[PDB]
């Protein structure tokens, strides 16, 4: 169970697919997926990536019965609010089961953390549904807090389909 | 009644930080505005910024009782989704009290969804006050949805001091 934890390079690309996959069918939206490697290629390795991603990598005689060294990875990038400042933000983060447990998630998080200090980010983001109190329970141990319930916010969106509309008036 | 929605230029700041100070006595978050004038040129112009802003400027007659032109802005950036990719994320969107019913957010959202487009962003997100009816209302009538609602997501949030507990304790 030797692993560690590194920034994904262009090379990772079908890695990190797998593991949003990974992630899907670990929540059976697996079908959800529209996501290509190139669009992770085009899309973080490019003149401005959208994301950033941190993996982790076992050795040799650790990897998956599938072949593959990579075994989790945190999907993350910078965002900004007016009234907090600069913020880390934490889209995905997810760990194979068979890999749990040996220190992997903590190492992420550490880095994660120093990522943010150098950045100069004064908080941390991220989405955890409200019935998983496990995982809820996890982030409040680590100091979190819910904004949504605290301040009274709800998160919105407006599908590509209505964009265009709105985008192609008249 | 003519107003017109375009990006905003670094001259801009002056209109956007009042803008952003007024949006927040809306939001009931005043106090904590932590964006300066010079930073809203330097992150939002000093090439290749954080952000991305939007004003909306009306005619001579119906300047502000202050001679104000600027009565509106949206600040953006974007975002990364691993089902979909690329988003379009709205931070803050804002029109003046005396400004309200007559098309200017509608045009400010006009303006955002061509943003998308262009920028192949599959969907936009935003925060809503949970009492903001008007806001939610409006969002809803031009195809949002309540990702909350629908989803159970909460937003959490880790700030400096815990960050600082998790970089430095292995
Ligand atoms: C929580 C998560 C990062 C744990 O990763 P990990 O590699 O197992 O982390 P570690 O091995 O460093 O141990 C982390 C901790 O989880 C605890 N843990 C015990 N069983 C666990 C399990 N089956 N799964 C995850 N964590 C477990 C460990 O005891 C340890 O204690 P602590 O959380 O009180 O500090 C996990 O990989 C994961 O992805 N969980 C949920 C998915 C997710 O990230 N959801 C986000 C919702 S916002
Ligand atoms: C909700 C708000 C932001 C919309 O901005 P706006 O400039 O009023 O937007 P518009 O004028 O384009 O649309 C206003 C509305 O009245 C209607 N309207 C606009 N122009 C109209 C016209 N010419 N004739 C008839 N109705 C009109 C629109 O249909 C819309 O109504 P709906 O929400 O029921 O669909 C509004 O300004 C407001 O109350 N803002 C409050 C501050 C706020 O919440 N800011 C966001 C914090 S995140």
Chains 1, 2 share one sequence.
Not at 12 to 18: E, Y
Request: aromatic letters at 14%; charged letters at 30%; proline letters at 4%.
């Amino acid at each position: 169970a030797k692993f560690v934890i590194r920034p994904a390079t262009a090379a990772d690309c079908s890695d990190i697919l797998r593991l949003i996959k990974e992630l899907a069918k670990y929540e059976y939206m697996e079908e959800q997926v529209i996501l290509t490697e190139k669009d992770l290629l085009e899309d973080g390795f490019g003149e401005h990536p959208f994301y950033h991603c941190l993996v982790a990598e076992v050795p040799k005689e650790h990897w998956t019965p599938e072949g593959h060294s990579i075994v989790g990875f945190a999907m993350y990038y910078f965002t900004y609010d007016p009234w907090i400042g600069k913020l880390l933000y934490l889209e995905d983060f997810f760990v194979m089961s068979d890999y749990r447990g040996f220190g992997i998630g903590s190492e992420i998080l550490k880095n994660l953390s120093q990522v943010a200090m150098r950045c100069r980010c004064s908080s941390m983001h991220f989405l955890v549904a409200e019935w998983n109190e496990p995982s809820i329970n996890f982030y409040k141990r680590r100091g979190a807090s819910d904004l949504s319930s605290e301040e009274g916010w709800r998160l919105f969106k407006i599908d590509k389909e209505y964009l265009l509309k709105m985008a192609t008036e008249e």
